[PDB]
């Protein structure tokens, strides 16, 4: 049983709709900003992939009440794809054959803090109130989407740090591989805060050198590059079985014909390679199209960018693809970078263009010989690839094809 | 489609730090809970836990352990015993494609969370915080941290569904082997247990609070005067294999996975629906020639919870159900650990031929009025047990686990 995308949503540095992310993508448009936030709190990475948004009211009181930013950022996600797959409730809601998977890598550092803060003051469980565990747990995405959407069907995360969402969706089409649900809503969120980003700045993670300059601090494949730009956002995706698609005159972007899992069991936070390769090679199992585009996980940190850069010369050899790293324009959002990335190469196949690796002034000499394209680029594309390589050594890769 | 089986467990929970200290408090009756001053203190009402007894220090190599939290240590330890239990060397598992791991917790670790924003506020920022606190606190710790040391190549991910989440990760594990992606999974999880999580659910009401005096009496489920549970920490591991692998190098195998259910309510957030279970049940009953011989319940000991899961059971089941007992008023609610654990506890009544008992019963629930609630240990010849596992945000999961 064959899956396929019939609906996104999405909400990021970029835009917060897919016109504007188109926009953004066709412009090599940064969404990077200084933080002060980032500043205050005592960092030395003072830069981000903010969502430009003002969520207060698009929500439900009684709903957004339960809910967190990673949840927030879904959730709106969820009715843009909903709405973009044409769906409607009696389609999807009270409906078992119809489910939901999404996560986030860190839940709710921000709402864990609250509730030990509050705890510790003069007002005690009073100060904490009733929907911190809602916000904080690591299933909140999950959780808070599932309810009030009315989702009868599978509902529960995944989590794998940077591979989250992009985990979410290949668990999704194995749903309906194996006949259990019709439809899957899969995706991510991730909230935006000093309080998960210091952690990453204190292990030397996060870029610090271009805090004058916010919008080339994410740069991808350019010798000067030192870490990523964390972000906050969300995505989602409709993926459907097919017949069922085609039944009710979906509209389709693409099917998932190649989803690669795999682990590295080697190091804790440095990539082996190892891994990733194979990653790659369990998605083209089966795919006999070549690969137009890769977007690739590409954070911007030294060792990381070079690993993922050997990984597809093995795989590809002198067969390599047009490669961008578009975190050079949105920064990382960790969790959600799965889905949106996944949206992003889905717009690029959709509207035939290539997405500029963008900030690229001194090109790493471990990436001479491969496309890496640096312009935006009209190309009719059939076939792209997205990596996605979290801490833990945990690997994702999905494979798209127009029909 | 492939055939799962169980091929070895490991636990590390508040009524034993291994299988065998486990059956042995099942078969007593044994309560895990016990006061807690770390509670008390941190101005909670809520004053009794299921704690795990074990000093953990020196059981897992320096460089490895400095990554983890303790639902990762719970986790690791519960792994350990269960690659020994199933027989395995790294000859067989490690550096192996085929060979996965899918493990997590309800809340990652609230503890190393604020630790590291404590520390960044305090005068030397940065450099308090140091580079572990990520592994520690990220969602992931579980997967993360036990798939590096233990050279796993194939799937690494956890599983996330609040109280739901090593049972979902169990049944991920069987679909990997049906899918004819994976020979071996490790399945299960781990969670911590420390009051920077537990103010959370007292804050809710959701934690027993007139029973501190009496620590062992707190966890009552199904009895009229049940006031919330008790919050415990752990982990569990148990080994999912494929049939044909297992058989070919003469593995132990306590039992075959027959039915997974996974569903949701689509309702409310923090109270049950009751028929988001029922199909749950069902589903994981489908197919499934024999009767169900023994369920262990989720049961938390809440009021409203309780007494739900029952109006499921009785229609699911009708006038013929099976023996039911709530485990958790012997060890407490482990939150993402109590999927696996309670799976594990319902394997070892499969195995040794007997029901826990259903304890701190003094007055049976009038809404339990005529279904089966096992309240002391009985000697019983199982074929066919089912373990129920449902979540805040109204996710449910449901294994049912056959001898071969
Ligand atoms: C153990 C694996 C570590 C990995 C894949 C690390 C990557 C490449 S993934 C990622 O987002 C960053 C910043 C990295 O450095
Ligand atoms: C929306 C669903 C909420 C559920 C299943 C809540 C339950 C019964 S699950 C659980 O662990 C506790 C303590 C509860 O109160």
């Not at 610090?208 to 989602?236: C, L, Q, W």
């Not at 496309?371 to 945990?394: A, K, P, Q, Y």
Request: charged residues 20%; proline residues 3%; contains cysteine.
């Amino acid at each position: 049983k064959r899956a396929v995308i019939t609906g996104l949503g999405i909400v990021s540095s970029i835009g917060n709709n897919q016109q504007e992310v188109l926009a953004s993508l066709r412009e090599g448009r940064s969404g990077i900003t200084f933080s002060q936030e980032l500043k205050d709190s005592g960092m030395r990475s003072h830069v981000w992939g903010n969502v430009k948004l003002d969520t207060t009211g698009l929500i439900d009181r009684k709903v957004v009440r339960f809910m967190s930013d990673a949840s927030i950022y879904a959730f709106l996600s969820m009715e843009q794809a909903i709405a973009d797959a044409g769906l409607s409730p009696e389609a999807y809601q009270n409906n078992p054959r119809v489910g939901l998977i999404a996560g986030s890598g860190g839940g709710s550092p921000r709402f864990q803090v609250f509730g030990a803060d509050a705890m510790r003051g003069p007002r005690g469980l009073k100060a904490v109130g009733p929907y911190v565990v809602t916000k904080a747990m690591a299933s909140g995405v999950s959780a808070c989407l599932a309810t009030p959407f009315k989702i009868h069907g599978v509902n529960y995360s995944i989590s794998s740090a940077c591979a989250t969402s992009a985990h979410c969706i290949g668990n999704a089409v194995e749903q309906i591989q194996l006949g259990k649900q019709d439809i899957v809503f899969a995706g991510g969120g991730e909230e935006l805060c000093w309080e998960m980003a210091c952690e990453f700045d204190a292990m030397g993670a996060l870029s610090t050198k271009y805090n004058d300059t916010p919008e080339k601090a994410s740069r991808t494949y350019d010798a000067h590059r030192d870490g990523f730009v964390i972000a906050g956002g969300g995505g989602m995706v409709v993926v459907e079985e097919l017949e069922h698609a085609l039944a009710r005159g979906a509209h389709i972007y693409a099917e998932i014909v190649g989803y690669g899992a795999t682990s590295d069991g080697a190091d804790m936070v440095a990539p082996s390679g190892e891994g990733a390769v194979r990653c790659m090679k369990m998605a083209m199992h089966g795919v006999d199209t070549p690969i137009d585009y890769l977007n690739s996980h590409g954070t911007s940190t030294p060792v990381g960018d070079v690993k993922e850069l050997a990984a597809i010369r093995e795989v590809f050899g002198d067969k390599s693809p047009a490669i961008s790293a578009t975190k050079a324009m949105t920064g990382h959002s960790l969790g959600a970078a799965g889905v949106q990335e996944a949206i992003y190469s889905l717009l690029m196949l959709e509207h035939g263009f290539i997405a500029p690796s963008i900030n690229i002034e001194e090109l790493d000499e471990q990436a001479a010989g491969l496309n890496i394209v640096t312009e935006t680029t009209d190309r009719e594309l059939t076939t792209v690839m997205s990596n996605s390589f979290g801490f833990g050594g945990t690997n994702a890769t999905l494979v798209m094809r127009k029909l």
